[PDB]
Amino acid sequence: GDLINTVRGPIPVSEAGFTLTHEHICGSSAGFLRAWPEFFGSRKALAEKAVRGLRHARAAGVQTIVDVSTFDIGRDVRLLAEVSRAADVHIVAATGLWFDPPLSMRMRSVEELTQFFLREIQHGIEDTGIRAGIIKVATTGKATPFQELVLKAAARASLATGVPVTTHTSASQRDGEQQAAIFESEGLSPSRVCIGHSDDTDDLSYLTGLAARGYLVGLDRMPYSAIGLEGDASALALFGTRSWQTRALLIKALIDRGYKDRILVSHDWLFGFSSYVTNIMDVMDRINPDGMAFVPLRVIPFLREKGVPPETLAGVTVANPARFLSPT
């Protein structure tokens, strides 16, 4: 009975089960869902859509998602409690900062960031009492000077509390390596850290370099492909031109090289998206109507059929998430 915090309260680690470890109920901005609920039709329409989508993943075998929306992704922890109950799926919430932090965060020192993250982990997000169970952090290239601070503060808050840290990278620019240097300079154990979006590159030199050091490797955009959408300039920059299979192969690729224990797999999916072009979410829904059941329905059986054994895939979808989220 080691235990982790979800938006409905504590749970036993061993009940986390099949866990998608990089997901979003809604990709937004701080204060936005409350200032402009209609952007999304309504708070009510959004919740109902999350709920339908999560019951879908849940039918498919998913029991937990980790919602890595930070303050600046507009994390609404009330909405997460409310879809979590309605759909009967555990949702682990996040602290940390993504790459859209407002001036109130950007003016802060490493010491004050660390107080902010610890607050959300140890006391509760906002006035709610709901505790973040993962720390989210981000670079898009060389870490900006403020990003260095967030990363060091992320590492301190993790050593204090034992909550894992997880990251956004621009994977083509091999951010994970800097990211790891910064965390390591703070004494953080690589097995407390997941380097995310790593399925955005096919650079296995890069990926096995991280895995070999003990980092978890987040293969977390499985359904993101813009094949057949070549005249959709915003779809392209976001989805890329590699297929879902090409991504799913990375998983086998690491398993064949002995790195089964260092993989986490997810969709980086959402049910609403205000922080990009208008209607991106219709686009997304056409390219992947399965939303967050895409991994269990498409990716696992594809792995099974390329000869990956079931015990191995269990270790990836259950054991690794469990090892990772377990406060250490």
CB 215 within 8 A of CB 192: no
CB 167 within 8 A of CB 176: yes
The reply on whether position 73 binds ligand DPF by CB under 6 A is: yes
Determine the residue with CB nearest ligand DPF. Answer: 27
The reply on whether position 268 binds ligand DPF by CB under 6 A is: yes
Say if residue 206 is exposed, middle or buried (CB neighbours under 10 Å; 0-12, 13-18, 19+): buried
Which residue's CB is nearer to ligand DPF, number 156 or number 168? Answer: 168
Say if residue 142 is exposed, middle or buried (CB neighbours under 10 Å; 0-12, 13-18, 19+): exposed
Is 90 one of the annotated binding-site residues? no
Is 136 one of the annotated binding-site residues? yes
Is 268 one of the annotated binding-site residues? yes
The reply on whether position 24 binds ligand DPF by CB under 6 A is: yes
Which residue's CB is nearer to Co ion, number 51 or number 235? Answer: 235
The reply on whether position 27 binds ligand DPF by CB under 6 A is: yes
Taking Cα atoms as reference points, which of 81, 144, 98 lies closest to residue 275? 98
Which residue's CB is nearer to ligand DPF, number 226 or number 303? Answer: 226
The reply on whether position 220 binds ligand DPF by CB under 6 A is: no
> What are the residues binding Co ion (CB under 5 A)?
168
Beta strand 216-219 with 193-195 is parallel
Is 24 one of the annotated binding-site residues? yes
Q: What is the pattern of x (binds Fe ion, CB under 5 A) and - over residues 240-279?
A: ----------------------------x-----------
Measuring CA to CA, how many Å separate 63 from each of 129, 175, 195, 221? 23, 31, 23, 19
Nearest-approach distance from CB 96 to ligand DPF, in angstroms: 12
CB 124 within 8 A of CB 131: yes
- State phi, psi for 62 to the nearest 5 degrees: -75, 130
Distance in angstroms (rounded) separating the CA atoms of residues 120 and 23: 19
The reply on whether position 67 binds ligand DPF by CB under 6 A is: no
Q: How many CB atoms lie within 10 A of CB 141?
A: 13
Which residue's CB is nearer to ligand DPF, number 268 or number 290? Answer: 268
Nearest-approach distance from CB 21 to Fe ion, in angstroms: 11
Which residue's CB is nearer to Co ion, number 66 or number 313? Answer: 66
Q: What is the pattern of x (binds Fe ion, CB under 5 A) and - over residues 41-60?
A: --------------------
Determine the residue with CB nearest Fe ion. Answer: 268
Measuring CA to CA, how many Å separate 161 from each of 187, 252, 327? 14, 33, 7
In angstroms and rounded to an integer, the radius of gyration of the C-alpha atoms of the chain is: 18
Residue for token digits 């034992």?
162
- Which residues participate in the annotated binding site? 22, 24, 136, 168, 197, 268
- Which residues participate in the annotated binding site for Fe(2+)? 22, 24, 136, 268
- Which residues participate in the annotated binding site for Zn(2+)? 22, 24, 136, 168, 197, 268
Query: Which residues form the interface with Fe ion (CB under 5 A)?
Result: 268
Query: Which residues form the interface with ligand DPF (CB under 6 A)?
Result: 24, 27, 73, 168, 268, 275
